[PDB]
Amino acid sequence: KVEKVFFVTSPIYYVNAAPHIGHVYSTLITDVIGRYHRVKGERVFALTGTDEHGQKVAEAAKQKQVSPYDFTTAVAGEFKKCFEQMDYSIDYFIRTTNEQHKAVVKELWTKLEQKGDIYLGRYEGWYSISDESFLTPQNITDGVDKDGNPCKVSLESGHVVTWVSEENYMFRLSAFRERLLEWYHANPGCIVPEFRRREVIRAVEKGLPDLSVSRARATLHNWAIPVPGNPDHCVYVWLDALTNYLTGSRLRVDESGKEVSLVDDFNELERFPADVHVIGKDILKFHAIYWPAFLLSAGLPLPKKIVAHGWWTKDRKVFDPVEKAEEFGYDALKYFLLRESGFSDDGDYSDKNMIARLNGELADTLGNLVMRCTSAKINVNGEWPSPAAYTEEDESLIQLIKDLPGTADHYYLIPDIQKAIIAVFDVLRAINAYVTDMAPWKLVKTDPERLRTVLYITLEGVRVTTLLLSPILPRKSVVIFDMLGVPEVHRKGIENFEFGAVPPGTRLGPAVEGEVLFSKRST
Numbered sequence: 388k389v390e391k392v393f394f395v396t397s398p399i400y401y402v403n404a405a406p407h408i409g410h411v412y413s414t415l416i417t418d419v420i421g422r423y424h425r426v427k428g429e430r431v432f433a434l435t436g437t438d439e440h441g442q443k444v445a446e447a448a449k450q451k452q453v454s455p456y457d458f459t460t461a462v463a464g465e466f467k468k469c470f471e472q473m474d475y476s477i478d479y480f481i482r483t484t485n486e487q488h489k490a491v492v493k494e495l496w497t498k499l500e501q502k503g504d505i506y507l508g509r510y511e512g513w514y515s516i517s518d519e520s521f522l523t524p525q526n527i528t529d530g531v532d533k534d535g536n537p538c539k540v541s542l543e544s545g546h547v548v549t550w551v552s553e554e555n556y557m558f559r560l561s562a563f564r565e566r567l568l569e570w571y572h573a574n575p576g577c578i579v580p581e582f583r584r585r586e587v588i589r590a591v592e593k594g595l596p597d598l599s600v601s602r603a604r605a606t607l608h609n610w611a612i613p614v615p616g617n618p619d620h621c622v623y624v625w626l627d628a629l630t631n632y633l634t635g636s637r638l639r640v641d642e643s644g645k646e647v648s649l650v651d652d653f654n655e656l657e658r659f660p661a662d663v664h665v666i667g668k669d670i671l672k673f674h675a676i677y678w679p680a681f682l683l684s685a686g687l688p689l690p691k692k693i694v695a696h697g698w699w700t701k702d703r704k705v706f707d708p709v710e711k712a713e714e715f716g717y718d719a720l721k722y723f724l725l726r727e728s729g730f731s732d733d734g735d736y737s738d739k740n741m742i743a744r745l746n747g748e749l750a751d752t753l754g755n756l757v758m759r760c761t762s763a764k765i766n767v768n769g770e771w772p773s774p775a776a777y778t779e780e781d782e783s784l785i786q787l788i789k790d791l792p793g794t795a796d797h798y799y800l801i802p803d804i805q806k807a808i809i810a811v812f813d814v815l816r817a818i819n820a821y822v823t824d825m826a827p828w829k830l831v832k833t834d835p836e837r838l839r840t841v842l843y844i845t846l847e848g849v850r851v852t853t854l855l856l857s858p859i860l861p862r863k864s865v866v867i868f869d870m871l872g873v874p875e876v877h878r879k880g881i882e883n884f885e886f887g888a889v890p891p892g893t894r895l896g897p898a899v900e901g902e903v904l905f906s907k908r909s910t
């Protein structure tokens with residue numbers, strides 16, 4: 388019960404290679420969640436960015452034979468170009484090379500050391516460079532390296548692992564087991580979906596070793612943040628990386644989305660801790676185990692929710708998001724990725740199924756419906772009519788429209804965007820059945836009063852559904868509201884989740900001779 392900036396993040400992505408889907412997916416989920424809270428009238432800060440340090444990224448820049456500084460800048464430019472083309476509404480793009488971020492990392496590091504949670508030790512064990520992840524012997528197995536020779540690989544990811552024996556600064560993660568366990572249990576929604584929350588607990592129950600938070604300077608090709616007070620060591624890319632969330636919460640951003648100052652105290656901008664960390668299933672441990680343990684050591688507040696979707700947010704496997712968005716449309720693609728993907732990789736991403744959902748749901752259910760209630764043939768006055776008396780059937784439909792907001796609200800807040808969309812379209816399917824059942828095209832001649840009632844209900848249903856769909860279909864929801872003639876003030880705010888927010892007499896927006904909202908793609 389504290390009014391605060393709703394702070395939602397994506398992961399920051401390794402810039403070892405171009406952006407692809409998945410990066411786009413993760414950022415989409417972050418964008419949608421942020422958008423939904425904006426239509427509720429809440430303050431929002433959506434964060435995304437790039438993870439530019441590390442052995443991975445340094446060695447990727449070597450293979451392209453160019454400077455780390457030049458390489459990280461260039462790939463990051465590609466991430467921004469991509470995210471702008473994607474038409475998101477993110478508030479800030481962060482980069483771990485940012486000088487103010489570096490400052491926050493060092494500040495955090497010192498905090499951890501002053502608390503006595505960092506000591507000089509050794510790590511002697513396996514490491515996946517591609518994952519920047521330490522692994523116990525039970526998490527590797529036999530495999531083949533890039534030359535076809537025998538080697539070891541992560542069971543997590545199948546990437547090549549190498550044995551590391553280094554004197555590192557070690558963090559006392561073992562000491563935080565009992566407090567994390569308390570945290571998971573006191574806050575049973577803090578990790579979503581449930582079966583990933585159960586995975587985290589089982590792992591932490593088993594026992595936690597201490598974590599290596601530094602590495603030898605040479606190993607990282609001097610591409611990392613120096614450990615404060617020890618120039619021989621660099622900060623573990625993951626500590627560095629996770630700290631972006633804290634950095635983001637402390638950056639004042641200007642008109643153009645550029646940082647202009649870093650604040651001393653996170654309370655100043657009221658963002659920290661994150662309300663939702665959006666992540667892929669591949670990085671759960673860093674966020675649900677390491678991250679909270681660091682925060683507990685530093686006396687910082689823990690995030691409210693971590694949601695981990697069913698995608699490998701990096702290095703999976705030809706599905707270009709821009710080329711698909713130019714083919715099928717931008718809101719349609721976003722709708723398709725959000726509708727087809729629950730909390731699994733079991734989704735069907737063929738063109739066949741993209742067309743089935745476009746035509747099936749977007750066109751026949753949403754599109755057809757929007758036309759009917761604006762059609763000059765049916766809505767002959769091009770206005771919102773005054774409803775007459777309601778039948779029990781009218782009420783049954785109206786009831787669905789009234790209950791829809793609270794239900795979609797809960798789903799968005801889980802967060803489960805698929806279930807929110809499904810819940811909206813269930814109401815859309817019902818409105819269409821109602822209209823088929825009522826044949827308003829016939830009512831124009833036979834019963835004008837009954838038409839008034841039918842058409843009003845259809846308009847409000849289309850408005851309320853379109854409102855709750857506006858985070859998924861941002862550009863199209865604007866086109867729909869324009870057709871319905873909905874004033875700007877009524878496109879936002881929980882006030883306008885209520886039935887009858889737009890008054891009768893409201894005039895529809897101007898039409899165009901060959902206009903179509905969602906265009907049917909031939910199979």
Ligand code: MET
Nearest residue numbers: 398399400401438628629
């Ligand atoms: C703190 S989020 C770091 C995520 C990592 N850079 C990745 O691409 O998976």
